Design an enzyme around this catalytic site. Sequence first.
Site, PDB file in Angstrom:
ATOM      1  N   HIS A   1      94.642  61.610  58.780  1.00 50.76           N
ATOM      2  CA  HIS A   1      93.359  62.303  58.631  1.00 50.76           C
ATOM      3  C   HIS A   1      93.250  63.591  59.446  1.00 50.76           C
ATOM      4  O   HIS A   1      92.289  64.345  59.291  1.00 50.76           O
ATOM      5  CB  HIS A   1      92.180  61.373  58.956  1.00 50.76           C
TER       6      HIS A   1
ATOM      7  N   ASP B   1      96.721  55.302  57.942  1.00 50.21           N
ATOM      8  CA  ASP B   1      96.431  56.590  58.569  1.00 50.21           C
ATOM      9  C   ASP B   1      97.565  57.110  59.455  1.00 50.21           C
ATOM     10  O   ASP B   1      97.453  57.136  60.681  1.00 50.21           O
ATOM     11  CB  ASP B   1      95.140  56.442  59.381  1.00 50.21           C
TER      12      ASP B   1
ATOM     13  N   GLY C   1      88.754  64.401  68.943  1.00 54.30           N
ATOM     14  CA  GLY C   1      89.838  65.127  69.584  1.00 54.30           C
ATOM     15  C   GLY C   1      90.977  64.200  69.980  1.00 54.30           C
ATOM     16  O   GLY C   1      92.098  64.652  70.218  1.00 54.30           O
TER      17      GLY C   1
ATOM     18  N   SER D   1      92.051  61.566  68.019  1.00 55.87           N
ATOM     19  CA  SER D   1      92.777  61.124  66.822  1.00 55.87           C
ATOM     20  C   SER D   1      94.226  61.583  66.788  1.00 55.87           C
ATOM     21  O   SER D   1      94.541  62.696  67.199  1.00 55.87           O
ATOM     22  CB  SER D   1      92.080  61.616  65.547  1.00 55.87           C
ATOM     23  N   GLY D   2      95.097  60.718  66.275  1.00 57.37           N
ATOM     24  CA  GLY D   2      96.507  61.047  66.181  1.00 57.37           C
ATOM     25  C   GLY D   2      97.252  60.681  67.445  1.00 57.37           C
ATOM     26  O   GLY D   2      98.477  60.539  67.426  1.00 57.37           O
TER      27      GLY D   2
END
EC number: 3.4.21.1
Lengths: 58, 239
Positions: B53, B98, B187, B189-190
């Site tokens: 995402h 994801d 911020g 995410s990932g």
Amino acid sequence: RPDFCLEPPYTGPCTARIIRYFYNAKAGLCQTFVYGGCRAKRNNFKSAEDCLRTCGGA
Amino acid sequence: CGVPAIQPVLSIVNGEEAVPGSWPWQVSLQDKTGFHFCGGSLINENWVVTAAHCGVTTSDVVVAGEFDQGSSSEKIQKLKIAKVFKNSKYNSLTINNDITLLKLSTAASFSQTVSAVCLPSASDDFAAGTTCVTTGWGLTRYANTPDRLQQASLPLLSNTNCKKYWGTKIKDAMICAGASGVSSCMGDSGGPLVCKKNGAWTLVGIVSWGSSTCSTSTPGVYARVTALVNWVQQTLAAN
């Protein structure tokens, strides 16, 4: 203009920090906001130009 | 992998500043202007694993060896992205699967502050209650991002306990952690959710989604790496 243009910006449940544009009917301009990366509503554009072409004047 | 040259000191909303360089696999994904939009984890010198995402493209850059994003003098590695591999099964509606892999144009130069996190085996079982850690430059209050890398220790939650809140929104490629006083936020995410496996920090989850207000009493949801690691290995092998 589409009614989705009158909806406040929606960040969503994801936690990315992506800059997107939304039309602000109160100001008559497209402004930036932080989009989380998923489940975007329609008043969410990748450029100010796309936003103004779609929601300008709403 | 999984062994920082600089040991982290433990004890993101309600997290704490990390010891500089103690999470060497943590990278910052930025656009051409230097704007941080997501975190990521180095899995080797040529690949970074992040969330699907985050929408990374070849125009974005991977920044490794960073601690203080407010420091212009700090030594870091700005790595260009050669190709983006978004898991074709990523469901933009349910947020399941994801995960995205980033192949660097130029390999990262590993060092005391830049190294890889270990990947788990598809069959690995990380028990609920296990204390793991997540890191990132996401908001510390639901506002601008903190300059310095943050960290937080949090427990893995059983699917049964997670579903007690999120119900059927929890899918098979998702794992929950948190609801313990800390929370990943915009911020983060990932970024990584790591737990020790035989003493080595291993990527168990990827910051994905959760409370719309980053509530610290709600379960955080992460991409379950064990359910996606075969796809990761297959992608690396074919590229």
